[PDB]
């Protein structure tokens, strides 16, 4: 799932993998 | 009209090889599915098929005599030339060349030619 | 020959006549294209039945035929003396084309 | 052709009349998928592929969508989404020979099934599970193509059948083949039926400002319903309105 | 040498007219920001054809005269000519450094761009001619031919770009006049994925499900 500030606010974006540990597939937060 | 006509020496000594040319008209042997074959009939016995040649240069012979039979053609001359080596006296018989189709196993037959094997 | 026929058969004018032909199962299979040829002495055989009961152009309308299993059968309706001739069945065999032993018809 | 290395022809830019086929009925078998052989006479097509070959009379069963067997597997597959028609007839009268007609050939086996519509002309030895024989025949190392050897003393199922399969497509391209139907004036206002190159529907036809680019045969609504067509004779973009329609 | 492709390489995928509408298609396409490979004539080697090609060049001299296609150099040829363009098929053979059987055909500061797509036996061509690195910007190649039939070479101080198509999903915006005015390659990045998932070029502030995902099985085992 994609986190967005709203497109014309910025093209910056973040992404959330809703049900997984990290260390499977930068700045990362678990 | 579509016709066939046997030709060649009717008397051949047994050491020699008989050669017979069947001339045809009214069709081209190059036509798909058409063939020309030979049939002989010694006096009072049944007929025997000798050889057949198809439009596609494909040759067939009776296996009992295939070793001796050799058939050839020249489409430019509308002629089929048959040859068979080492005439046995018993080979003396009437010979026919005939037009062939699978559906019409021998449709039209030439007049036929006598063949004799002796001095 | 792999094809056999009665040496002769007899009929009379206006009656039907049948000449049977016997194949050899080991190299006739479907026994297809079984033809019949008339041959008066000293003349080239003339095809008259090509497939069973099927007649090539220039049909003499009295001539007809049939088949039953390994047995073929020529049929002529309303015999006439002109029918008196040799009759040869013929059929393909995988090794070669073959002719029957012929039948000397007599048309009493 | 052999069904090995079957032939293909790009039949196109012409007027068909399949009634000449469907009504001739001389051929033993005729089957269609995605169209009836009758309605078929009144359609247009972007392109037509006619392919033809010879096979055993029983093998015709395999020349259908989704079949399995050596013919379908290694000679002529058909896609499950196929549309077209298969015709075949006993051609023993033309294709048998007294000694087997070895002109025709079929690949008896292959490393894998063919693509659903591909052709394969290769003739390498099919390798054995043994070490490769490098063109030497042997243990499972076989020449890939067998001959039917058609001859007349042969069962009807085994008699040679020559086959034509027609296949065709319905792309965005203009039609290049159509049936023999005539064509009318365009009654460009009233609620009418229309049949533009086979595009069948009902509506009020009208002029349009749609300004199609030259390749554009159709235009569509946001609903993806058809919305305009170029009249193929006028080459003019006509708008299509649905007829007067509502609840009473 | 290389350049970023930016948004170039859109083309009308199947010309059923659309206007003032957003619509999505899937096909072979040049990926956005693909790594276009840059060549100079000052040799011109064979390149693989892969699934298809984007080609563009800006030589004012028209020094790029054509192309040749298929292995062994059966083959397809396409060459410009005096007031003409021509195509043919044979197993031709010609020298590896060329400069100026079936289906002969004849027909007719500018950046010239081309796409060669070989699909379903049809060798589609799309093109545009536009006034001029690959100039960053957006335009769609229009269709030009669809004649039917694995590696290719250009036919000849001049320079051009090559890029390879790949399967990608696109959203296209059609202007009121039915020109493609903008596009998004849905594979490019999570923002592009969001845009395609929402079928809109702008997205309000918020969170959106882009897709499922799964760890694909690395291996197969049997008891
Ligand atoms: C988005 O664009 C409009 C018009 O440019 C602007 O007024 C607005 O502030 C932008 N969005 C946000 C969240 O500021
Ligand atoms: C994530 O994985 C690491 C090792 O792979 C493990 O130590 C950690 O506890 C895991 N965290 C969760 C939330 O599963
Ligand atoms: C078809 O083409 C002919 C010849 O150009 C022309 O005379 C005729 O008007 C055309 N008819 C239609 C229906 O377009
Ligand atoms: C483009 O491709 C070359 C190799 O083909 C590679 O070294 C280079 O990093 C690539 N550039 C980008 C931006 O991916
Ligand atoms: C549409 O076409 C007209 C005429 O060419 C032009 O005036 C108008 O600006 C165009 N609009 C767009 C969005 O292309």
Chosen from B104, B112, B114 to mutate, greatest number of chain C CBs within 10 A:
B104
D 80-119 near B (Cβ less than 8 A): 92-99, 101, 103
Q: Find chain D residues with C-beta within 8 A of C93's C-beta.
A: 153
H or E, element range at B116 = strand B113-117
Q: What token pair was written down for B34?
A: 């058409």
For E132-211, strand residue ranges (E) read 142-145, 151-155, 159-164, 166-174, 180-185, 206-208
Q: Write out the two tokens for D100.
A: 């087997």
Q: How many CB atoms lie within 10 A of CB D147?
A: 15
CA–CA separation, D224 and A2 (whole Å): 29
Residue E222: inside a domain: no
- Chain D touched by C33 (CB under 8 Å): yes
Place of tokens 């000293």: C42
Contact status, residue E210 vs residue E190, Cβ threshold 8 Å: yes
Hey, which residues does B109 pair with through a beta bridge?
B98
Determination technique for this entry = cryo-EM
Read off the CATH number of the domain in which E173 is found. 2.60.120.960
Nearest to B58 by CA among D1, D199, D96: D96
Distance, in Å, from the CA atom of A15 to the CA atom of A2, rounded to the nearest integer, reads 4
Assess C23–B contact: CB distance below 8 Å, yes or no: no
List all residues 6 or more positions away from C26 whose beta carbon is below 8 Å from its beta carbon: none
SS3 C63: strand
Q: In this structure, is residue E102 part of a structural domain? A: yes
With an 8 Å Cβ cutoff, are B52 and D98 in contact?
Answer: yes
| Pairing label, strands E159-164, E35-40 | antiparallel
**Rounded (5°) CA angle A16-A19-A20:** 90
Tell me how far CA of residue D205 lies from CA of D6, D229, D238, D243, in angstroms.
46, 10, 6, 9
Specify the length of chain D in residues.
Answer: 248
CB contact (8 A) between residue D151 and residue C32? no
Beta strands, E only, chain D: 7-9, 14-15, 29-33, 44-45, 47-56, 84-90, 105-107, 145-147, 160-169, 177-178, 191-194, 201-207, 218-220, 226-231, 236-241
DSSP E134: P
**CA–CA separation, B36 vs B73, rounded Å?**
10
Encode C8-39: b = buried (16+ Cβ within 10 Å), e = exposed: ebebeeeeebebbbbbeeeebbbbbbbbbbbb
Contact between C27 and C95 (Cβ < 8 Å): yes
Q: Which residues pair with E71 in a beta bridge?
A: none
Q: Are B98 and B36 in contact (CB under 8 A)?
A: yes
Q: Using only C-alpha atoms, what is the Rg of chain A? A: 11
Domain residue limits at E23: 2-209
Token pair for D29: 């078998």
CA distances C44 to C66, C85, C87, D179, D220, Å, are 24, 12, 12, 52, 75
d(CA D130, CA A13): 57
- Distances in Å between the Cα of A11 and the Cα atoms of D236, E185, E190 are 44, 15, 10
d(CA E175, CA C69): 78
Radius of gyration in angstroms for the set of CA atoms belonging to chain E, rounded to a whole number: 20
Ligand positioned closest to the Cα atom of A7:
1
SS (H, E, C) A1-30: CEEECCCCCCCCCEECCCCCCCCCCCCCCC
Domains in chain E, number = 1
Phi, psi values for residue B51, rounded to 5°? -150, 160
Other CB atoms within a 10 A radius of the CB of residue A27 amount to: 4
**Distances in Å between the alpha carbon of D114 and those of C93, D106, D122, E73?**
37, 13, 12, 27
∠ Cα D36 D40 D42 (to 5°): 140
The maximal CA–CA distance of chain C, rounded, in angstroms, is 40
Q: How far is the CA of E191 from the centre of ligand 2 (A)?
A: 28
Ligand 4 centroid–CA E37 distance in Å is 9
| Structure-block tokens of residue B4 | 């066939």
Domain annotation for chain B: domains and CATH numbers: 3-117 (2.60.40.10)
Closest listed residue to residue C80, CA positions, set C59, C105, C58? C105
Does residue D138 come out as left (phi exceeding 0), alpha (psi in the -120 to 50 range) or beta?
left
Instruction: Judge whether E219 lies within some domain.
Output: no
Candidates E188, E186, E108, E172; CA nearest to E139 is E172
Judging by DSSP bridges, how do beta strands B48-54 and B35-41 pair with one another?
A: antiparallel
- From the list D94, D99, D152, the residue facing B33 with the nearest CB is D94
Within chain E, strands assigned E span 2-4, 21-29, 35-40, 47-48, 53-57, 66-69, 75-81, 84-90, 102-107, 110-119, 122-131, 142-145, 151-155, 159-164, 166-174, 180-185, 206-208
Note whether E79 and E13 are within 8 A (CB): no
Domains and CATH numbers, chain C: 8-107 (2.60.40.10)
Token reading at C74:
């020529």
The set of residues, in sequence order, having a beta carbon less than 8 Å from that of D204 and lying 6+ positions away, is: D189, D190, D191, D192, D240, D241, D242, D243, D244
Looking at beta carbons, which residues of chain B come within 8 Å of D92?
Answer: 102
d(CA D217, CA D215): 6
Could you tell me the sign of the dihedral formed by the alpha carbons of D52, D56, D60, D65, in that order?
A: negative
CA distances from C43 to B10, C38, C46 (A): 17, 9, 9
**CB within 8 Å: E191 and A13:** yes
Expressed in angstroms and rounded, the spacing between residue D171 Cα and the centre of ligand 3 is 24
Is E214 within the bounds of a domain?
A: no
Q: Do B109 and C97 touch (CB under 8 A)?
A: no
Residue E159, domain member (yes or no): yes
Q: Is E221 a domain residue?
A: no
| CB atoms near residue D139 (< 10 Å) | 11
CB C78 within 8 A of CB C61: no
* Bridge-based pairing state of the strands B93-100 and B35-41: antiparallel
| Residues of chain C with C-beta less than 8 angstroms from the C-beta of D154 | 29-30
Pocket of ligand 2 from Cβ distances under 6 Å = A 21, 23
The answer to whether B55 and B32 have CB atoms below 8 angstroms apart is yes
In terms of Cβ atoms closer than 10 Å to its own Cβ (0-12, 13-18, 19+), residue E71 is: exposed
Question: What backbone torsions phi and psi does residue B82 show, to the nearest 5 degrees?
Answer: -100, 145
**CA–CA gap between residue D205 and residue D183 (Å, rounded):** 16
d(CA C47, CA B29): 20
On the 0-12 / 13-18 / 19+ scale of CB atoms within 10 A, E133 is: exposed
How many CA atoms lie within 13 Å of E180's alpha carbon, on the beta-carbon side?
25
- Residue E220 neighbours by CB under 8 Å, 6+ apart: none
Output the six-digit token pair for B115: 């063949």
Q: Are E207 and A3 in contact (CB under 8 A)?
A: yes
Provide residues with CB under 6 Å of ligand 1: A 6, 8-9
Q: How far apart are CA E212 and CA A1, in angstroms?
A: 8
Examine residue E217 and state whether it is found in any structural domain, yes or no: no
Task: Using DSSP bridges, classify how beta strands E53-57 and E110-119 pair: parallel, antiparallel or unpaired.
Answer: antiparallel
CB D5 within 8 A of CB D52: no
* Element of type H or E holding C35: strand C35-39
Check: CB of residue D125 under 8 Å from CB of residue D143: yes
Q: CA-CA distance, E126 to E131, in Å (whole number)?
A: 17
3-state secondary structure B26-89: CCCCCCCCCEEEEEEECCCCCCEEEEEEECCCCEEECCCCCCCEEEEEEHHHCEEEEEECCCCH
Nearest to D17 by CA among D145, D179, D171: D179
In angstroms, how far is the first alpha carbon of chain D from the final one?
A: 64
Q: Exposed, middle or buried: residue E100 (CB in 10 Å: 0-12, 13-18, 19+)?
A: exposed
Q: Do D151 and C30 touch (CB under 8 A)?
A: no
The answer to whether the CB of D71 falls within 8 A of the CB of D145 is no
Q: Which residue carries 């030619």 as its tokens?
A: B113
Helix (H) or strand (E) holding C18: strand C17-22
Q: Is residue E198 part of a domain?
A: yes
């Amino acid at each position: 799932s994609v986190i967005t500030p709203g497109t014309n606010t910025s093209n910056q974006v973040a992404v959330l993998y809703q049900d997984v540990n990290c260390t499977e597939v930068s700045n990362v937060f678990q | 009209q579509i016709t066939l006509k046997e030709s060649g020496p009717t008397l051949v000594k047994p050491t020699q090889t008989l050669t017979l040319t069947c001339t045809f008209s009214g069709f081209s042997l190059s036509t798909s599915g058409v063939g020309v074959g030979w049939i002989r009939q010694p006096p009072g016995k049944a007929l025997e098929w000798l050889a057949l040649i198809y439009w596609d240069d494909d040759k067939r012979y009776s296996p009992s005599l295939k070793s001796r039979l050799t058939i050839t053609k020249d489409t430019s001359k509308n002629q089929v030339v048959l040859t068979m080596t080492n005439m046995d006296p018993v080979d003396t018989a009437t010979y026919y060349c005939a037009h062939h189709k699978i559906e019409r196993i021998f449709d039209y037959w030439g007049q036929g030619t006598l063949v004799t094997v002796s001095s | 020959s792999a094809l056999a026929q009665p040496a002769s058969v007899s009929g009379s004018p206006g009656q039907s006549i049948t000449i049977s032909c016997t194949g050899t199962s080991s190299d006739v299979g479907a026994y297809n294209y079984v033809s019949w040829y008339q041959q008066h002495p000293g003349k080239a055989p003339k095809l008259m039945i090509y497939d069973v009961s099927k007649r090539p152009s220039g049909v003499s309308n009295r001539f007809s035929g049939s088949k039953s299993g390994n047995t073929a059968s020529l049929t002529i309706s309303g015999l006439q003396a002109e029918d008196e001739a040799d009759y040869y069945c013929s059929s393909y065999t995988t090794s070669s084309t073959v002719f029957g032993g012929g039948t000397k018809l007599t048309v009493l | 052709a052999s069904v090995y290395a079957w032939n293909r022809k790009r039949i196109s830019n012409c007027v068909a009349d399949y009634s000449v086929l469907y009504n001739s009925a001389s051929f033993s078998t005729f089957k269609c998928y995605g169209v009836s052989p009758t309605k078929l006479n009144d359609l247009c097509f972007t392109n037509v592929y006619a392919d033809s070959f010879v096979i055993r009379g029983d093998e015709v069963r395999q020349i259908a969508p989704g079949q399995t067997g050596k013919i379908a597997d290694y000679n002529y597959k058909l896609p499950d989404d196929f549309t077209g028609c298969v015709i075949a007839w006993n051609s023993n009268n033309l294709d048998s020979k007294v000694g087997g007609n070895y002109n025709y050939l079929y690949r008896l086996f292959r490393k894998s099934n063919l693509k659903p519509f591909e052709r394969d002309i290769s003739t390498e030895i099919y390798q054995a599970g043994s070490t490769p024989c490098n063109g030497v025949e042997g243990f499972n190392c076989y020449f890939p193509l067998q001959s039917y050897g058609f001859q007349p003393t042969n069962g009807v199922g085994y008699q040679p059948y020559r086959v034509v399969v027609l296949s065709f497509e319905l792309l965005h391209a203009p039609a290049t083949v159509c049936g023999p139907k005539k064509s009318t004036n365009l009654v460009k206002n009233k609620c009418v039926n229309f049949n533009f190159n086979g595009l069948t529907g009902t509506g009020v036809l009208t002029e349009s400002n749609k300004k199609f680019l030259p390749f554009q045969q159709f235009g569509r609504d946001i609903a993806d319903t058809t919305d305009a067509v170029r009249d193929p004779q006028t080459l003019e973009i006509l708008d299509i309105t649905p007829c007067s329609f509502g609840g009473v | 040498a290389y350049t970023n492709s930016f948004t170039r390489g859109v083309y009308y995928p199947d010309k059923v007219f659309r206007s003032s509408v957003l619509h999505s298609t899937q096909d072979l396409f040049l990926p956005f920001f693909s790594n276009v490979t840059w060549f100079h004539a000052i040799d011109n080697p064979v390149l693989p054809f892969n699934d298809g090609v984007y080609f563009a060049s800006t030589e004012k001299s028209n020094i790029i005269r054509g192309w040749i296609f298929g292995t062994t150099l059966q083959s397809l040829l396409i060459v410009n000519n005096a007031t003409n363009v021509v195509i043919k098929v044979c197993e031709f053979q010609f020298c590896n450094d060329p400069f100026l059987c079936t289906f002969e055909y004849v027909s007719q500061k500018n950046l010239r761009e081309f796409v060669f797509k070989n699909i379903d036996g049809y060798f589609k061509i799309y093109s545009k001619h536009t006034p001029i690195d690959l100039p960053q910007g957006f335009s769609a190649l229009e269709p030009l031919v669809d004649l039917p039939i694995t590696r290719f070479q250009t036919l000849l101080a001049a320079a051009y770009y090559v890029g390879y198509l790949q399967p990608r999903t696109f959203l296209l915006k059609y202007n009121e006049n039915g020109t493609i005015t903008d596009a998004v390659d849905c594979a490019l990045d999570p923002l592009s994925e969001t845009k395609c998932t929402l079928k809109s070029f702008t997205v309000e502030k918020g969170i959106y499900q882009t897709s499922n995902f799964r760890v694909q099985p690395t291996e197969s085992i049997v008891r």
